[PDB]
Amino acid sequence: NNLYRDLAPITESAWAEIELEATRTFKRHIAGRRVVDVSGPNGPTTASVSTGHLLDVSPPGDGVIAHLRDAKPLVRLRVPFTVARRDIDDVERGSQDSDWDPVKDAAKKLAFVEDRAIFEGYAAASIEGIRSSSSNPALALPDDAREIPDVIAQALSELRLAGVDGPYSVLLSAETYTKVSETTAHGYPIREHINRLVDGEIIWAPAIDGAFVLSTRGGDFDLQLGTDVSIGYLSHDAEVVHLYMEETMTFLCYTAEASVALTP
Amino acid sequence: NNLYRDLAPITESAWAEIELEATRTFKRHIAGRRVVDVSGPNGPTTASVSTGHLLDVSPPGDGVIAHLRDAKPLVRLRVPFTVARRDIDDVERGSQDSDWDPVKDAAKKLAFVEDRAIFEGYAAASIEGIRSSSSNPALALPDDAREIPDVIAQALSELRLAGVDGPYSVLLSAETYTKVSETTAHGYPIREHINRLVDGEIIWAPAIDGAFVLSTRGGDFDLQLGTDVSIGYLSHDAEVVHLYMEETMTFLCYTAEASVALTP
Amino acid sequence: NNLYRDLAPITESAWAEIELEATRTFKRHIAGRRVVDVSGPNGPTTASVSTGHLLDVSPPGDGVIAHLRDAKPLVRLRVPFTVARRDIDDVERGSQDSDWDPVKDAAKKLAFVEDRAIFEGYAAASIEGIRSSSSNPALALPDDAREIPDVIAQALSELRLAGVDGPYSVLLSAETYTKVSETTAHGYPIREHINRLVDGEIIWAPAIDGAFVLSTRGGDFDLQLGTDVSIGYLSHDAEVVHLYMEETMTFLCYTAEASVALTP
């Protein structure tokens, strides 16, 4: 009800088209949710996640010991966008090529923001990313792609020597993903070697910079959602309708030695 | 299990006696829980209470609007105390007059701390009390007790003129309670007049300073408990056992004009 | 009962977390138990393993022949470690990132000790390892990884010429494992060649020095356990709890020509 979608001059079919486009774009442009554990929507009443720690505070009086409970607040991210009214009206007339580019742009922006917060951190929201939280030393991606299989093999060894078990996955930036896809060593593609090195999967991650090697055993990275991605309405005009894409979330990292970062 | 009561050299009967004494003392010395609404124990995993508000924060990037969710953290209060081992051992021998004075002192201290936090506030825990949160102007208790019925009648009128309804209750400090109990006007006790003025009850509140006139309709004052009063064990010796009384709580005031403070 | 875990100030959830971490780390860091035959726990009353041989001794008197029965005693290995009490207490408050690094370190130390005893021997315990017990001549690992497939093929031939049958497995040190994983010959990875040479499996063995080629038909290597890995409690303080990881075991090698050692 807080979305006020009933006040928007948008028909049911137009809403369905917009939602389909947004879902497709967000699914295509998101990679963090494919590795970390998602704590599903807890409702609009959720404002923070309890960590279970205690913080020393001044006692209310003599002879009393006081401790505050520690919690991490959620953050709400809102990406506004605008949709032309003629495109909405053409849907009911059988139009199959309505312009939903703003929806795609908003979905891409929200997905990139979420991925960067998960992996690179968001200081204002008190989110420490996987890269900063990792304790394993960071490796460097080689200049030539033919050496990528070696470095990924060095990281895995680290994860094995730290006691971290379970399937291992590699998240590669767009440039690194393309380089690995097209590179061959004496005619032998290097993807067929990385696929054998890694028993998990290679993930298309267009939002990160370098590469990440993580252990997907479970219980190391938790994305807490208070509210999942939702589309709402602000106002409209004789020509345009103003909507927004919204999400309330936070990220927590528990295991520091379950990730290795390969810098560019 | 976190109380570690199984490691203490205390028998079941001694535990029962200690708990009975603590419960009696805390019930006798507490007055805040008789007026405000208690949100019962939510378990050890509760660290904060969501308020439903939003705080502006710096956006993660251009074209995005960010808001943090606001929450009030809980605070844990711990009052340690010590019990002699001979008194514990005498319980199994049929002793009916074991020394539980430390338990009573700890219970009184915890109850007074909780009452003062509810009514006078606790800045370090971000708790704003009923007195500071109230918007109605504060009245002054008269020098002579015979005029107390008039001032209480002035406060009620205020509560009526602000639109606040429901039963009205008066919390009186120990000195004011005794003065009202013993005072008479031309032989007519003033308690029989205050009882007719007030359709709720007169509450013995030995922790507050002056007096409070509140509306007990409901939904104005909320004491959130993460964990109720519990007794735990720290360590022991050949002569003494070290225990503590613990409670995790916070207080929230919603209706500012549902209370009037009568200063001493 | 001899572990005295009931005296420890540790809750059930903390015990579960500690045991889970220890099991994960030990499973990740152990390789001997994946090849040899494990004679399961026989109970605390087991003190030695009978070999079935006889030792000449001085007769008690004229006209009598005396022989002592030969047995190999078990050895108990204990690795103490310490855990902070605040981390234990945070588990009941919903903490998901408690510090169990000491448990991981103890598990790694115990696993490495057991692996080195199985493969390199432990003279004080009268344990002769696989390397010293082997009768086949030891080969040398080549300087360049591209020649590793050849040497492993030389060892297998030896095992075939000695009459040893059954699946063959290769245990590689961490360095050799990584080298084999990353090395390629004219773009063709050498793992795809070693996997075809060997009909068993390639085992990650971070405790051994060079490499081992063994026959896993069965009945050649026996790890006798009197008591499996178990966690016990020694004492505690106001800040820390002292625990230990314990195991009673011995190792026996029967077939001398069922193993080949490739030195670094």
Author numbering:
A (entry chain TA), B (entry chain A), C (entry chain WA): 2 to 265
Question: From the publication, what sentences describe this entry?
Answer:
Cryogenic electron microscopy reveals the overall architecture of the encapsulated dimeric NfsB within the nanoreactor environment and identifies multiple pore states in the shell. The crystal and cryo-EM structures of encapsulins from close homologs, have multiple openings in their capsid shells, including a threefold pore and an five-fold pore. These openings are thought to be the channels for the substrates and/or products of the cargo protein. The cryo-EM map in this area was ambiguous however and appears to be the superimposition of flexible states. To resolve this, the pentameric subunit was examined by 3-D classification and resulting volumes were refined using local refinement without symmetry constraints. This isolation a series of volumes that could be categorized as open, closed or uninterpretable. The open and closed particles were pooled and refined to yield complete, unambiguous maps (ESI†). The closed pore inner circle diameter in this structure was 4.62 Å. The primary drive of this is a shift in the pore forming loop (measuring 3.84 Å between the displaced His188 alpha carbon, see attached movies M1 and M2). The underlying cause of this movement is unclear and may represent an equilibrium of states when resting at cellular pH or could be a result of different packing states within the particles stacks.
An alternative, promising approach involves protein capsids, such as encapsulins, which can be viewed as genetically encoded enzyme encapsulation, and is particularly suitable for immobilization or within physiological conditions. The capsids, comprised of 60–240 subunits arranged in an icosahedral structure, engage with a conserved C-terminal encapsulin localization sequence (ELS), or a more extended N-terminal encapsulation-mediating domain, found on the guest protein. Our study showcases the encapsulation of the nitroreductase NfsB, which we produced as a fused dimer, within encapsulins.
